[PDB]
Ligand binder design. Structure first.
Ligand SMILES: OC[C@H]1O[C@H](O[C@H]2[C@H](O)[C@@H](O)[C@@H](O)O[C@@H]2CO)[C@H](O)[C@@H](O)[C@@H]1O
Length: 553
């Protein structure tokens, strides 16, 4: 379901979609090709699901951080711009859309969060974050609020977290370390802890989201908000006289917002690649086209040199660039999905009081690291010289495995878990145990008990007959556990601290977005992407969670 000779474009709702459609219409008029511009919800999550089937839009507009993940799954076409054309755009923007040396998207614009303030309610904005609690006390007296911004998305929360020294992935030498995730460090704790206090002292509300905060600032009910260029259009149509400035400092350090480069990527499934190329290069990425989009809802500082020269005279763009400078540009790697999901949970849970700050962030680190290790794929291989024609869907396999382990004595369950837990990280222990359980399934062992056979005992029912289903369930778990390398250590961390349910939830969200649908034909050895591993991870986690039933370790 793609469509030849027609362009379908997906872009986020807060951006200038109407303005982009205006560009679309100018394309239709000249070239005679129909351009539809849609703005699905959960757009970034929907695309990889749809694109994996072969369906989906021809062009996708998102910030560059998602694109490496898309590229690794093979859902983006490599772009081939002319060297002459590349010279029209700033070179750093190209770097944002370069994954493993291939260009994978057209950079459109640079966006970064800036502090937006109402000049009437407050003539002089606060240079520090630590001033804000005081001013809220003051503005509460006039019936107003000091600060409201979106707390649901970590994009907005992050600059504060990153200020004193939070980071996503350590970037030393010039290359990212996936195993080193900086959400559990002191600076991150400090930053988040502060944010939580503002909610704890009724200066902000945990329930606040994009709609509420935007509404409140534009109705004049609050003195400040934190937001990107796109937001300015709706404030302009509003009555408010506003300014755009640098974000407040925390612990005498600047807020470090993550910086996105809004980028357009061409679906690998699309037959309209040359159409898309022409549309982006010659129609969108021109002074005329960008102006159309920008006029609807501002892009920020565009990638196009010619048009940026015009825009840079604006004071609001200068404010945006000062913030972008103080912050860091987002990595485009696949692991960013993992990072973001982890932090999203942590922040919401610490704000809602569901977990302590130190706990939420300590989980986020484990889960981010586990996951990020899962998406690696590079330098993954085997060593060797029965095998198992497993014939079964993976969603089915788990359904069966969980069903067998459900029907077990609480004492046997505990015995299984302890024996499986010892395998995490130790390949010899996992190898030994697979041979043992295979010996029982072939031969005969019988009721009894031991210091490592408490498991083998649990394969037998309450009459001392063997349940074959139990043994294979264990073998299937161990076969899955083999696929896992570095993240085994983190699965063990999760089991220990009791954060498997969070990990599972997270694995489930990045498995594109289904499970039922991310399982069809049984392993043909012709597939094998991030999929094979994430499945194993999901299995290993789900089983350990099932066995750590309810609330136990
Ligand atoms: O909240 C995590 C989210 O942040 C970024 O998405 C931004 C992006 O710069 C814009 O598209 C704008 O609409 O705000 C979004 C946040 O609401 C990342 O691009 C994205 O990966 C991440 O999920």
């Amino acid at each position: 379901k793609i469509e030849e000779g027609k362009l379908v474009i997906w872009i986020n709702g807060d951006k200038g979609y109407n303005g982009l459609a205006e560009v679309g219409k100018k394309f239709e008029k000249d070239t005679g090709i129909k351009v539809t511009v849609e703005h699905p919800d959960k757009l970034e999550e929907k695309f990889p699901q749809v694109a994996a089937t072969g369906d989906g839009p021809d062009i996708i507009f998102w910030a560059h951080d998602r694109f490496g993940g898309y590229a690794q799954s093979g859902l983006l076409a490599e772009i081939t711009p002319a060297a002459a054309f590349q010279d029209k755009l700033y070179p750093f923007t190209w770097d944002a859309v370069r994954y493993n040396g291939k260009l994978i998207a057209y950079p459109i614009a640079v966006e970064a969060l800036s502090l937006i303030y109402n000049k009437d309610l407050l003539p002089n904005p606060p240079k520090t974050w630590e001033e804000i609690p005081a001013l809220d006390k003051e503005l509460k007296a006039k019936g107003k609020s000091a600060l409201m911004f979106n707390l649901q998305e970590p994009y907005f929360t992050w600059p504060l977290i990153a200020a004193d020294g939070g980071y996503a992935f350590k970037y030393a030498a010039g290359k990212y370390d996936i195993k080193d995730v900086g959400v559990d460090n002191a600076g991150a704790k400090a930053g988040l802890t502060f944010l939580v206090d503002l909610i704890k002292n009724k200066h902000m509300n945990a329930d606040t989201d994009y709609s509420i905060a935007e509404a409140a600032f534009n109705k004049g009910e609050t003195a400040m908000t934190i937001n990107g260029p796109w937001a300015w259009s709706n404030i302009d149509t509003s009555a408010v006289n506003y300014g755009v400035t640098v974000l407040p400092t925390f612990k005498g350090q600047p807020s470090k917002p993550f910086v996105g480069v809004l980028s357009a990527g061409i679906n690998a499934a699309s037959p309209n690649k040359e159409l898309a190329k022409e549309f982006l290069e010659n129609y969108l990425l021109t002074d005329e086209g960008l102006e159309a989009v920008n006029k609807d809802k501002p892009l920020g500082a565009v990638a196009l040199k010619s048009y940026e020269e015009e825009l840079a005279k604006d004071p609001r763009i200068a404010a945006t660039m000062e913030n972008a400078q103080k912050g860091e540009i987002m990595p485009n790697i696949p692991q960013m999905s993992a990072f973001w999901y982890a932090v999203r949970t942590a922040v919401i849970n610490a704000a809602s009081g569901r977990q302590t700050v130190d706990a939420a962030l300590a989980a986020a680190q484990t889960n981010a690291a586990a996951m990020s290790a899962g998406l690696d794929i590079h330098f993954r291989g085997k060593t060797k010289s029965l095998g198992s024609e497993d014939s079964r869907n993976m969603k089915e396999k788990l359904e069966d495995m969980e069903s067998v382990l459900k029907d077990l004595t609480e004492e046997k369950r505990k015995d299984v878990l302890n024996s499986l837990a010892k395998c995490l990280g130790k390949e010899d222990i996992r190898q030994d145990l697979e041979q043992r359980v295979s010996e029982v399934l072939i031969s005969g062992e019988l009721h009894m008990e031991d210091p490592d056979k408490p498991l083998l005992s649990s394969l037998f029912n309450a009459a001392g007959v063997l349940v074959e289903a139990r043994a294979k369930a264990i073998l299937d778990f161990l076969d899955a556990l083999l696929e896992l390398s570095e993240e085994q250590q983190f699965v063990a961390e999760a089991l220990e601290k009791g954060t498997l349910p969070l990990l599972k939830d997270q694995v489930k969200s990045v498995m594109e977005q289904n499970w039922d649908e991310l399982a069809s034909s049984p392993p043909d050895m012709d597939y094998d992407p991030e999929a094979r591993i994430l499945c194993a991870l999901y299995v290993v986690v789900s089983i350990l969670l099932e066995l750590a039933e309810g609330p136990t370790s």
